[PDB]
Every structure is written in structure tokens, then in C-alpha cells.
Amino acid sequence: SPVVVGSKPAQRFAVLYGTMCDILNGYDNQVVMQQKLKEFIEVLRDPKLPYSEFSAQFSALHARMPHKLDAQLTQVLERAQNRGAEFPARQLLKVFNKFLDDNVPNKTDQDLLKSTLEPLTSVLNLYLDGQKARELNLIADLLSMYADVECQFSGRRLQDEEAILKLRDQYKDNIQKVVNTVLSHKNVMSKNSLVLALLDEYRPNKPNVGNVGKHLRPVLRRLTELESRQSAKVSLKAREVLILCSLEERTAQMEHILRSSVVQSRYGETGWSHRRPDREVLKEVVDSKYTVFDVLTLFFAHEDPYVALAALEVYVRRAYRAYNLREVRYHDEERPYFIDWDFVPSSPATPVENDFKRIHSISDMTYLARRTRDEPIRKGVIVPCKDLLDAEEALSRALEVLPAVVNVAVRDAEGKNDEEILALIKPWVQNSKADLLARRVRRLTFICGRNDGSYPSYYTFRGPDYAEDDSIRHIEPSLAFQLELGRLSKFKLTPVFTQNKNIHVYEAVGRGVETDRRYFTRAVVRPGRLAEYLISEADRVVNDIFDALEIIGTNKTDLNHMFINFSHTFQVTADEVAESLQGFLDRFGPRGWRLRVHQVEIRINCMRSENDTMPLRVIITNTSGFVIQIELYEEKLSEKGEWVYYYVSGNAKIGSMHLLPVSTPYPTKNWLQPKRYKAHILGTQYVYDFPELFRQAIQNSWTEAVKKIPSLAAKQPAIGECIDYNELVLGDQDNLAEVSREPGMNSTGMVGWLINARTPEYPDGRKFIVVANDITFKIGSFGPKEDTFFFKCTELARKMGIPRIYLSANSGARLGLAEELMPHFNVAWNDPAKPEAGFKYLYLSDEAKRRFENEVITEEIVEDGEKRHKIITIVGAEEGLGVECLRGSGLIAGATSRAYNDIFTCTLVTCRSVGIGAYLVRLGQRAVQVEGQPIILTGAPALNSLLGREVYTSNLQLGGTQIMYRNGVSHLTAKDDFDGVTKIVQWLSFIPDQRNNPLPILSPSPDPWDRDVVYTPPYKQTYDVRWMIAGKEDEDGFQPGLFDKDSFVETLGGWARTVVVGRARLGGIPMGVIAVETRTIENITPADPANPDSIEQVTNEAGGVWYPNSAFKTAQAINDFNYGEQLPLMILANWRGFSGGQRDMYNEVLKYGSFIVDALTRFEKPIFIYIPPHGELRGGSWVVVDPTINPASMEMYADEEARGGVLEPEGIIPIKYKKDKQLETMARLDPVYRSLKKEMAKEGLSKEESDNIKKKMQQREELLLPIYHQICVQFADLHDRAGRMKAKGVIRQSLQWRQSRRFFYWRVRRRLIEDDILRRIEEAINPANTSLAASPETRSPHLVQLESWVGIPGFKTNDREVVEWYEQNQDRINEKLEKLKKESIADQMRELXXXXXXXXXXXX
């Protein structure tokens, strides 16, 4: 069949709209959605279509009514087709109205014409508006057609089509329409894909916010209400477009500004053309809030060569904003592009990290750190190319004006070239591999300008061969500082496609470990508005990321993060922003939770503080499945020249990440363990694992206490919350600061924590400091930073009063030499040919001398005619090589010595503790040693090398447990690192939470106070005195001691076991215990391997005697229970004197004996000396323990059946009851001896007769002598009896061992409280003993005042009655205190010529 010459595009337009009409109306016609849509857009844009639609219809209508009109219309069409392009639609309207409805007489006899020319009239009307407006007509029709059918299904509660059909019963015309609308809804899936493809095509609403945009504004707003699940996705897309409803008009705006820049008016002059572009006008574009890069890409292009220059200026000034300005030079060569700009503030600028003097690039976080004094400026070059092939000529010729950073623009938005464009830019860089290299340029960018508002694609080549870093893509090597990326350094990053060019998603996998697979998002937002704006801007950019993470998928990701940088300097403060944050996070949260996103970081600026920015970075983490991790920071520099994370958040400062650089490289997965490994090879836990060891130990302290003591158990604080620690790291002004940061990454070789542990004694909490060395951080050696640290912790624990715990694992002081001077120093020999012939000295070359000078003290002496700088002393730049470490070591040494005498001090040998470390163990006095860790002074191989022979092999052979516990350096032996902590937390249970705080007393509970002491020692043989303290575990039942069942903890019992020391509880009251071992113990000292003859020496320390080592043990213990611990004491005095044996005398027995007396005068808390049953206290022993030493705190008691005299009754008898004295008493009691005495006295008997009486008596006296001897022994023993002691007032009372417990419980408690009341009396009176009579009933002069305040008659006695009075009248004494406090104020103010000065001081 024949066809019309020009009807191809008309017929092709009428089918491509029809192939889309069938899908929207719900018919089966399914044809390729993307291709037929683009073909419809390509037939609405061609100027031939209006003519084509006319030529088809008019051909049949030529032979219609009055031809007069038919011919005149044809003339217009034919002329407009060749001459000019656009269709004369409006001319064709005018001619038809004039002839048809207007020329009623001739043209239209009757109203027939209207119907005939109707198809032509429906052509000149769709084109009257225009050709592109005809395109918009058939996109205000297909974007209304969808809404028309779908809205009813999302309509007035009708979600059912059948219910809808019954509702439709209303319209007659809807008879056919009922089914048509139902047919459409069924195939909505195909419809959604068509509308979405149409919404994406007209999405460049940003460029044209009028032609394609305003025309579509109302017919698109009728597409956001469709929230219904089916249309949900399409409604969201509609919203995107509306937000956009500028660049088309901006094309004009910027074009004008560039041209206005060129020729400055300055009316009254002929030639402004030559004048280069002016800042004032161009400034408007460069500093604008709007995106400029989005359109600018076409202006360097196809324009006047001068305008191309002006555009290049706009671009440079906008991007290199953070950078500095310096001479813009435009040269006009073959390619008029040549913009030569020169210039980085790097310290007070953008939040960056600067150490010493250094300046780095935006992308290159490592340029040249050395310094920027001997470094060039970075010469710029930006070229506008037209084609990709032609671009090469703007490279080889471009580079010639470079004696740095270079940018290259293009004009071919033809296609979205990827990989092929990368294969089209790489042949130009590999060819000029020496050309770009010679000029020393680091960065090269390639901008590709798209005309439909698509953000241009950037490709950057960096390094020596310029391998092209895939990291910087579709973004500028300037916008890059804002992208950071220097935080994902420990990750192999590879980016993935993003629909939005602002956002860049990166695949990150740990450099060491590949398991860690995370999607890190990096976005830079440019807020282009003309406080609620930024929070609404956050919703737009986070939604963009959520939709992009959707298409890439959640896949397999452990964690996901997204960074959103705000280029805006808005006036707000974080306090209100913290409330608005809460609002949108609960909505986005569930979506972010599916994508496996764990945290989000927002970096905003706040001009309102100064009217200068306060950059507030905020991290929101979804931890434990809970957020609440809303940490609001502040970008402030640490003084150290670095920008740190100073948070003033809302999660109550118990947060994470604090006072940390902005350059942290987001720690990966597993980075924690290799560190653990190096500690574990040494048999010690990694330092940061210890806080949790303590938690389990406290957890354990409760689980046992709840058993023994029920009821008082419910205050248990679960598994967690047992302890509440926070790290310690040196502050700004070297003043320790509480930080709650991630474990590991310690700044120094020492770490500390402030722990608030809820112990069962202090269930509300108790604090203490824990200091430990990182054995991984340089062998755990003691450098100056480590020393300054340790000190400031000691200082802190002291300030409070809370105990200190040191965990030792070190290698003495630090080691090093000057490494830098090793491959530079020269030698001056006696003879240069034979260097073995001795060397004169060591010198340094003049050129190598200037390199250091301050690192070496060099003297000048000319030898061989050379300027030789002989080294007279080496200094070295680095710290920790000599004396610097020793100075610090001595300081902390002193600090620990001072701390021991003030607060509770304790150390733990978790691993090898050498040199200084070893001493801090002793200065720490109270120490626990783990079975496989030595306290060594000098290295075991170092000793062998010095002696010349292999004597010692093990560091334990001289530092181990078998030495330090057996000599009293170690107080206890722990099987493992935890066992240590366990036994320590145990000591802590005996000690008050603070310094001058009441003891950790409990209810009588495991052992009641009102029980009699069952175990009584056998008088014949020896007994384990330990049984008298805690109790004797016997075959037949269990006989308890005078202290609580299972409460005793023995210490130092491996050295001088002749005295037993420990801590125990008396009816809940904890106190110090010292007792005398009765059994003959045998300590055997080991043989020294150093002297081969030295043998193991046998020493049998017979029980109940004081030896040099026993005395020292006694003395040490007294001071230990006195300083820090502050415990009451009980001494079961049972020594019968001292060993005056030569060896023991020479072994300075007397020196340590005095040390008991010294230690006793220093004590504050009450001390009880109780001689137990069978217990003895003769001569030398008594003296060093008598209450008159410290009558203020000592109290002495003796058992009813105890003994105490000047000497043993066996010793006194040959001095005061000699043989002659026994015979005078014999001739008195014995009847036989005095009868025989009557014979010799009367005489009258011969020489043989007198011999008889002599030989009769000296036989009778020989028989009576052994029993008469024992009589005097008993007689002498009656002197050393208890009754006598109470009678001469050397003891307070005679005590029955059975009811010792019962007496002391109340006497202990009575003295505890009384002592505190008296201390309080003095604190109020002045806010600043003398005889044998010094008895505790007269220990204080206030015990007279307190006596009358109480009102109890038997005050000095009836201990129980007294205690109970204080407890009741705690208010009445606080009444007396304040009375006296104001009375003492009156005395000091009255005591204050000096009156005339006071009458001047008052006037002031």
C-alpha cells in the first residue's frame, strides 16, 4: 500500500505512546519498558513530528470543504518546513478560526466544517504551546493516568477492588469504567516500572526548575499521597523530584557573571576587554552556598578564550578555599587554558593532625613532613579540552609551562564512559611517564562535565608512575580532606557505584585479616539554602545512603559506618540538636539495623559560641542492640598541636573515645590478640585483660559471702556492674584524666584505672587505683613518661586515701644509644694502614657535625690539616638511654616509699620485676608473687659473665618464690595471675575503703560473738598456735578459736616461722594477729652455688624464743598493720626471752629488737597484748612489748593460768634460794634434819661420835634435796603467777581463756568508737603517758569530760553498756561537738599594738 513522503515520525510517535498506553490502562501488551520510553522522548524532541502528524491527516482532508482555506494552510507548512524549523501551529489556529466558526457565510454554509477539520485542530493545539511543551503535555497526561486509577485503591478506606466496584454503583457512565480501572490495578507491577522510568528521566528537575519542572509540579504532587504498599516506592521517587523543584537559569546567571567580570563597565572608557577578571563580582560565585562545579564544566569550554580563563579562576578559588592564594598568571599559547596559580595553613586550619613543623596535601596525608622551608609551592594548571583524543595535545604542550597540582576539563557528556574512559586516559599517562615525572607534579585530576546537572566524574593519578588511586573517584583532590579516608588506612579499600555523586561507598577488609568485611560510607554535603534546615538536610542525605546501601545490599558485613561532613558554618549549638537527633534516629534506626549499620558520625560547625566555629562531631552507635550511645564531642586541640575528641555529651561522660586524635585509623577486627600473644609467651596476662580479672574476683567475693551470710546477700550487683573502672592518661597540663576509651592502644608503657568496686563490705562502692606496665610496650621498661605517669597515679591515690595496687611486669630502666650517630661518626687512628694499632679518639665530619651539634658535644682539633670535630660527649635526640630513666626511677621510688606510710600500698609480681621495678616491690612492702615470676636485681647471664663462670642459669634461681617468700620479701604465693587478684581482693576486704575510715565490720553471722573459746591448748606438749586463732579442725568435731571460723589469712610464714602473722575477724571486726609458735621449727638456708663450699645450713629455731629474723618479722608486721592498713592488733605473747647465743648476738639480734619498740610507739589504733594460757613472758621479751611504750593505744591482759617473771622459776632459785637457804628451811619443816641438828649443837660426843651425825645428815639432806628443790621452784612460780601481775598493776585484768572472745569483742568495739569520739573532741578543741601509772583507763585527758556526757556509773568497765550508749546518743555527742567547735573559734579569734592591726583588718 502507498505511504506519505513525510509520515514516518508521525506513525512512529502514535505507536510508542500506544505501547505505553496499554500498560498504564492494564492490558496484556508488554513491550520493553526502557527502550520504547526513550524512543517516545526522541520523537517528541524532533522538529519534524508536528509536520509529520499534519502531512498524514491533511492528505485525506485536501478534498474537503472550501479549498480557499486548504491551499493557504499548505503554503504556510511548506514555507516553514524548509525556511525555519518550528511548526506554525499558532498561524494554523488563527486561519482555521477565521474561516470555520468566524466565516459563517461563505466558508461554513452550515456548521459542518467544525467536524471535518477537527483532526487538524487537535494538532495545531498540542503544538501551539511549542515542541518541547508538546513533549511536557504527553508527560502531564501519563503521570496523571497512573494517579487517576491507583488513588481509588489507596482511596477512602477501600483497599478491596470488589468493595470498590459496589461503591462505583453510583455512576452510570462508570458501567464500562468499572472493569477498565480494575484491569489497570491488576497489572500495577508493569505500571510501577513505567512511571519509575519516566520519574528518573525528568529527575533532572535541578537544572530546569521551570520548563520540564513547574509544568510537572502539580501533576507530580498528585503522586506523594500514594503511601499504599503497591505504589510506596514510586511515591518516594516523586518526593525526590519535588524537593528539586535552577541550573538552566544558573547557566544564564553564571554566564552573565563571567562576562561582567571580563569587561568591567566603568562607564567612560573604551577598552576594558584586555583587563583580566575582577574578584569582587566573581567572589559571588566562588563563595556561594550552591554547587558551582555542577554547571561550570561547560564554561571553560566553547566560549570566548577570555571567558574560558574567567571560568578557570572561579573553579580554582572555590576548590582551593582551605589553601592559600598567590599570583594567577594566564598565558595565551596554542591552547588558551594556561592558568598558572601558586600557594596548607596546616595547624589552625581544618581539623587535621600536625606534629612539629609540617604541611601536607588534601589527598596525600604524607607529602614531605621534613619541613616546608626547603620545599616548592604547588604550581597549578587547569585546561578545558573539547574531546578525549584532542585532550592529549593539552598535556604535552600544557606541561611546557611548568619549571605541584594539575586539573583537566572535557566537553563530551555524550556517554557515561566507564573502564573505556579509563582505557582512554591511561595511554596518555603511560606515554608521558617521564614528562609528568620531570616537572615533579604529585596530583592530576580529570573533570567530565555533564549538561543535565549530573555531577562530573573525576579521575586522579598520583605517585611516581601515577598508577591512579581508585580511592579518589567522582570527587575532587580538594573536596577530599572533607572525605578524610586517612581513617581507613588499615583497610584495603575498593569503591562501589553510587547513583548520587556526593556519596561514596567503600568495601573495606582488614589489611592483616580478610574476615573483617565492612561497608564504609563517606559523604560531603554542600548545604545550598538561600536551625530546622540542617536536621531536615540530615534526613535527605541519610535516606540517599539507605537507598544506595539497599541496591549494593547488606551482603555479609560485621559492622557498617557512614560519615556525613557539613560544609556549612550554621549558627546553632549542639544542646538543641541533641533533642532533634533523638527524633529522626528512632525512624531510620530499624532500616539501618537491616543493612547491618552499627554507627553514624556527623561533623557539623557552630559559629555561635566569639562568632567563630565550634565544630561538633557526634557518634551514634547501636551497641547491645541499643543506641543510647549518643556521644556529643567538641573539636579542640590538646595543646600538643593535634585536634582531639573532647566530649561534653549526654550519655553522662561514661562514654567511649575521649581525648583521641581525629587521625585514629578505625581499629579493625582481631588487632587486639597479637599483643596478648607476646604477654602470654612470658606467662602473664595482657595488661588490659586485668580489669575484667578483678570483676570476676569481686563476683567471687560475693558468691561466697552470700553462702556464709545469707539475707545480707540480696545487695549483689549481678555479673556486670561489679566494678566500675575508667582508664587514666596524662592530661593537657600533665594532670591525670579519667578516660573511658577502648582497651589497648596505650600512649605510654604504663596504664592506670580508677575502679569503683562494690565489695560485700562496701556494697555501695569503694575506690582504688590500679597501675600496671605493658610488657609488650618496649619490654615493659621504665622510661621517663612511664615514671611521670606512675607518679601522678600514686599522687592521686594519696590525694583520695584509696589504696594503690601495682602490677609488676617490667625490665628495669630503658635502654638505648644514639642510633643516628652510628653510621656517621668517624675514627682517628694512630696509624691509618693498621687500625688495630690503637685509635686516638672519635671525631665527626664538619658536614655531619652541622647535622646534629645539639646531639653531640664536639670539640674542634685539627689533625692531618682537617677540621675534625672530636666527640667529647654524646647527648642523642631520643629519650631513654641513660640517666633520664634513672632520675624518673628515683622519683617514683621515693613516691612509693612516701605512699606506703600514708595509704594502703600493694604490689603483685604478674611477671619478671627487675631493677627499679624490683625495688618498687619492696617499697610497696606488701607483695604477692606468682609461682613462676622472679624478683631479680641483675640479669642471670649478666652475673655469670661478671663472675666468668656459669653459676646461675635461672632468673628464678635467684629471684623466684623459693627466695623472696622464704626471706620475707613476698607476703604470699599465688598459683596464677588470677589467683593473685583473688588473694588481693581478699586483703582489701580487711581494709577500710578510705584512709581514716571505719573498718569493714559485718554482723557476727558465721561465728557469733557470744560463744566461748572451746580450743584450749595442752599444757604438756606443743600445739599449733594457729588452732587457738581460727580453730582446730579435729578428728572429733571442730573446736573454734577466739577469732571467727574461717577468717585467718597468714602472711610471711615462710621466713622466721617462730612467729605467726596474719589478718582475721573477731565477731565481724577485722584485726591484725601476731602469735608465738611453740613447736621447734627448722628453717634450712640453701647452699650458695657462687661459693662451691657453701653448704645448706641447719637451723632449729626452737619454739617460743625470739631470733634476729623472728624479731624483724614482728617489727615489720607492726608497721604493716599500722601504715595504710590501720588495723587493731592482737598479740598472743608467749616468748620466754631471747637467744643470747654468740651467732644470734653477732647477727645484730639487738638491732631488730629495738625495731619492735620503735614500731610500737608509731601505732595509732588499739593494741592488745594478751598472754594466753600456758603462755610465758620473761625478761628481755616483756620489755619490748610493755603497754608503757605507747599507753595511748596499748592495753595489756594476761590469762589466769599464764606466767610472767624476771626469769624462769628454774633460773631464780640458784640466786635467791641457794642451797644454804634451802637447808635453813629444811631444819624447819623436815622433822629428821632438825632432830639431827640438836645432836651436833649439844656436843659431849667424841671425834668418832661427831663423824656419825655428819654422815647421817649428809645422807638425809641428799634425799630431801630433789623434792626441796622443786618446793622452791613452786615457791618461785607463785611469784610469776597472774594474780601478782594484776596486783602490781602491770596488766588490766586476769582473763579466762574461755571467755576471751566475749570480752574482747566489746572492748575492741568500745575502744574503736571511743578513740574516734576522742579524736573528734580534739578536732573541735584545737583544729591543729608521763608515768608507770599510764593505764588505758587514763589514756586521754578528755575521758573525764566524755565520762560526764555519757552518765554511766561503771564507765571504765561495763564495756557492752558503753557501746550501746554511743550508738543510741550519736545525736547528743554531735550536739557536744558543735558546742565545743564554736567555743574553740571564740578562743582563737580572741587571741588574734596587735589590737590596732585587728581594728584595721576589721575595717577591710
Residue numbers in the entry: 788 to 1032, 1036 to 1133, 1153 to 1212, 1253 to 1379, 1386 to 1464, 1469 to 2187, 2196 to 2259, 2300 to 2311
Describing publication, verbatim:
Biotin-dependent acetyl-CoA carboxylases (ACCs) are essential enzymes that catalyse the ATP-dependent carboxylation of acetyl-CoA to malonyl-CoA. Eukaryotic ACCs, instead, are multienzymes, which integrate all functional components into a single polypeptide chain of ∼2,300 amino acids2. In addition to the canonical ACC components, eukaryotic ACCs contain two non-catalytic regions, the large central domain (CD) and the BC–CT interaction domain (BT). Here we provide the structure of Saccharomyces cerevisiae (Sce) ACC CD, intermediate- and low-resolution structures of human (Hsa) ACC CD and larger fragments of fungal ACC from Chaetomium thermophilum (Cth).
